[PDB]
């Protein structure tokens, strides 16, 4: 039950080091990171890391820390959004919105968030507005060459300039709000994909949202199974099972027995968070 030190990385590319008991629940560490950030609406967030199997796993806030930690000297947890709500104007804390805008900033660069060209330009133009202020032909075009917010940004540079000339006078807090309003309508918003194959042997991807379970081909949404139309979620070894209310039980082959367990957990945790 001794104390250990854990290095947590924040959404602003900074890192801190906290000290928690080994036998303490994950919630204890999660509380320290929230109070360090003065995060009042921390319910939307979580701590994720890569395990020994090199797959990114959430930190169980109910289980002990030493159960899910291996070498706290080498592992870096990262504070990330865990649940993306549908309504965005209700996020009371301006800081809470700010961490979300940072989150979208990250997903935009990783490729976890893709969208239409004009949408992507507008989303960047708000990020630029929040960071360097009002438009300036000299400063802006320079700033887009020193900072790459989306892959293949150079081809999209002219459109970002146009949108930036419109955001004049908007504060960074006003820009984060515009980020969320424009990002929350995106097909890939808050979407973290789990690869799978149907009985047809078709390479697809499954995900979960506030509305329910999602099915993607590449990055295009295929089906949506709302919680109202989802009877039971199950998994056997390397096959996922979705029972509907009753059509049939759609089977999905996934990568490993752990992949099913991971997706199964976040499906229950998503429904339990919105119902």
Author numbering: 38 to 282, 290 to 319
Paper text:
FARP1 (FERM, RhoGEF and pleckstrin domain-containing protein 1) and its close homolog FARP2 were identified as guanine nucleotide exchange factors (GEFs) for RhoGTPases that play regulatory roles in neuronal development. FARP1 and FARP2 share a conserved domain architecture, containing a N-terminal 4.1, ezrin, radixin and moesin (FERM) domain, which is followed by a long linker (~200 residues) that connects to a Dbl-homology (DH) domain and two pleckstrin homology (PH) domains. We determined crystal structures of the FERM domains of zebrafish FARP1 (zfFARP1), mouse FARP2 (mFARP2) and zebrafish FARP2 (zfFARP2).
The FERM domain in FARP1 mediates interactions with the intracellular sequences of the transmembrane proteins PlexinA4 and SynCAM 15,8. While the FERM domains in FARP1 and DAL-1 only share ~40% sequence identity, the residues in the binding groove of these two FERM domains are nearly identical as shown by the structural superimposition, strongly suggesting that the interaction between FARP1 and SynCAM 1 uses the same binding mode. The corresponding site in the FERM domains of FARP1 and FARP2 contains a negatively charged residue (Asp97, Glu100 and Asp107 in zfFARP1, mFARP2 and zfFARP2, respectively), suggesting that it cannot serve as a phosphatidylinositol binding site in these FERM domains. A similar motif is also present in FRMD7 (FERM domain-containing protein 7), which has a FERM domain that is closely related to that in FARP1 and FARP2 (~60% sequence identity). The KRKR motif constitutes a major part of the positively charged surface, and may serve as a lipid binding site for targeting FARP1/2 to the plasma membrane.
